[PDB]
Amino acid sequence: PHDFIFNDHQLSAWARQTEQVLALMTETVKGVEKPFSGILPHELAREFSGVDLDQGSNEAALEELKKLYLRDAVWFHHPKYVAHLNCPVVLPSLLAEQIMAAVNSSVDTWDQSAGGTLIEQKVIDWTLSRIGLPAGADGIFTSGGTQSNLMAMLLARDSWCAAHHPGHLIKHRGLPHDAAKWRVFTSKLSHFSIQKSMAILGLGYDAVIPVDYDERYRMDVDCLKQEVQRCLQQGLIPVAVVATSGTTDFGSIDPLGAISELCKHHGMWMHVDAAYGCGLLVSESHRPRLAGIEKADSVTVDYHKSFFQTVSCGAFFVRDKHHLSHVTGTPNLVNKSIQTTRRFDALKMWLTLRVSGPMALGNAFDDILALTQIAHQLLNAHPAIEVLHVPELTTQIFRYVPDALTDEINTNIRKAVFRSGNAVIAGTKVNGRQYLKFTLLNPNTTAADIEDVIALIVHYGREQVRGP
């Protein structure tokens, strides 16, 4: 009778298994004293080596899971996880995943989702209301930021080809003769998905012209102007600009308004990469810091970085829904997607808004913005810490200065902090120099928590200088 299948017969076996994991996760989460254990990949691989997947009930697998996974997990909920763009998650997100695991709707078509199809559209339309895109706009949920950025360069590429080579559609015929000339402009601090996407699209990293940044690490529009004009004097064709409203390392917001004027003047597609920055769409006071986003031709948004939603939760938005035609009364969302089978990720944003306010999200995001201002204060205050910027969002790039030696010393500080497990820090190269990075996404993290991690950073730094 195939006892393993979710159905009416198995509802009691489902709820008891769910009861066991709550007991196991409750004990696990209560005994988390620190964000990581320090274990090294080779140390952990030792315990994987004699496991043989061609071979115990839930209780036995979960006992083994305890050791292989939970023991050394990176705990993003812990206040001292201040590394990459991994947010703590909110309860209505887990509420949604639990339901989603039972129904397993596929939201590519109405006939595999029903109300899931309409719910996604609601979340999308609500998002578009916050961005301020005009009437005929639309969007779609994707795997995340990377696939949204692919869809953005795909549409820029294909829409340009349709307006400049009369009914020569890339979809059918591939790339026209003059594609090798097309150029996309992005900040040197843009996410690498842009370049990866142009590889995939058959134009290569060479189609991307990196544009210098400001002294506040924002893309310099004077330098963009210069790049577009140098490009026009080589016979090359400017096609698009990627503006990043929250760079991954600096949290810096490119000047949206200025970029959008340059774009229109040269007929270019404006894509706003908001994967991190989209958190400001829910801030009572900070929302104005994204002004100029309403002008974009497309927008990428990650709810799984800045809206405390589990992975995957992210979406891609267009100003004009007709451009989505390059990717394709029954509502079938597959017509706007580059995936086929797709999970009901929108339930997460749907149940979050329904249960928790939208203002509950903004309150959190605001608290993390104010906390980062405090960390910038504490970092700058320190004579041994060199800070590069005042936080435009939730991230702070800094280093310990007691060149190729200062690089060694900071890369060893991060490795030590990691091995100690007592906090998780991230790293970045800025102009070929190793910096350390703090990204703040937990609004329960306090002043005292940041103080602790700073002391750890300077302990291990002084340890590199002084040796113990």
Within 281-320, the residues that bind a copy of itself by CB under 8 A are: 302, 304-305, 308, 310-312
464 is an interface residue for ligand PLP by CB under 6 A: no
The C-alpha atoms of residue 143 and residue 145 are separated, in whole angstroms, by 7
Residue 391, interface with ligand PLP (CB under 6 A)? no
Burial letters 91-114, b for 16+ CB under 10 A, else e:
ebbebbbeebeeeebbbbbbebbe
Distance CA 317, CA 119 (A): 16
Tokens of 309: 């939603």
Nearest to ligand PLP of 79, 144 (CB atom): 144
- For residues 290 and 304, the answer to whether their CB atoms sit within 8 Å is no
Q: Which of 295, 291, 271, 273 is nearest to 283 (CA)?
A: 291
Q: Does 14 help bind a copy of itself (rule: CB under 8 A)?
A: yes
Alpha helices in 312-357 (DSSP H): 346-355
Q: Which two tokens stand for residue 229?
A: 């004009």
List binders of a copy of itself among 43-102 (CB under 8 A).
Answer: 44-45, 48, 51, 53-54, 56-58, 60-61, 64-65, 68-78, 83-86, 88-95, 97-102
Could you tell me how far CA 460 lies from the centroid of its own chain?
30
Cα dihedral sign, 22-23-25-29: positive
Contacts to ligand PLP from residues 238-277, by CB under 6 A:
244, 246, 248, 273, 275-276
Q: Does 302 bind ligand PLP (CB under 6 A)?
A: yes
146 labelled ligand-binding? yes
Within positions 22 to 51, which residues make up the interface with ligand PLP, using CB under 6 A?
A: none
Nearest to 72 by CA among 32, 117, 115: 32
Residue 57 binds ligand PLP (CB under 6 A): no
273 binds, options a copy of itself, ligand PLP, none, Cβ within 5 to 8 A by partner type: ligand PLP
**Which of a copy of itself, ligand PLP, none is residue 64 near (CB under 5 to 8 Å by kind)?**
a copy of itself
Angle subtended by helix axes 58-65 and 11-30, to nearest 10: 20
Is residue 166 within the footprint of a copy of itself (CB under 8 A)?
no
Should residue 340 be labelled a site residue for a copy of itself when binding is judged by CB under 8 A? yes
109 is in an annotated binding site: no
328 contacts ligand PLP (rule: CB under 6 A): no
Q: Is 314 in the site for ligand PLP (CB under 6 A)?
A: yes
Angle, helix 346-355 to helix 115-131, in steps of 10 degrees: 70
The answer to the question of residue 167 lying near a copy of itself (CB under 8 A) is: no
Question: Hey, is 293 helix, strand or coil?
Answer: helix
- Determine if residue 168 is labeled as part of a ligand binding site: no
The reply to whether 304 sits in an annotated binding site is: yes
341 annotated as belonging to a binding site for a ligand: yes
DSSP category for residue 81: B
Specify whether the CB–CB gap between 273 and 58 falls below 8 A. Answer: no
Selected from 340, 404, 431, 468, the binder of ligand PLP by CB under 6 A is: 340
Among 136, 171, 433, 455, contact with a copy of itself (rule: CB under 8 A): 171
Residue 89, amino acid: V
Q: Are 437 and 426 in contact (CB under 8 A)?
A: yes
Least gap, CB of 313 to ligand PLP (angstroms) = 9
Range in contact with a copy of itself (rule: CB under 8 A) among 215-223, 237-245, 323-331, 377-385: 323-331
Exposed / middle / buried, residue 51 (Cβ in 10 Å: 0-12, 13-18, 19+) = exposed
Residues 270/260, Cβ–Cβ less than 8 Å: yes
- Taking CB under 8 A as the criterion, the residue among 134, 136, 357, 402 binding a copy of itself is 357
Could you tell me which residues are annotated as the binding site for pyridoxal 5'-phosphate?
145-146, 191, 248, 304, 341
Applying CB under 6 A, the residues found at the interface with ligand PLP are 85, 144-146, 149, 191, 193, 244, 246, 248, 273, 275-276, 302, 314, 339-341
Could you tell me which residues are annotated as the binding site?
145-146, 191, 248, 304, 341
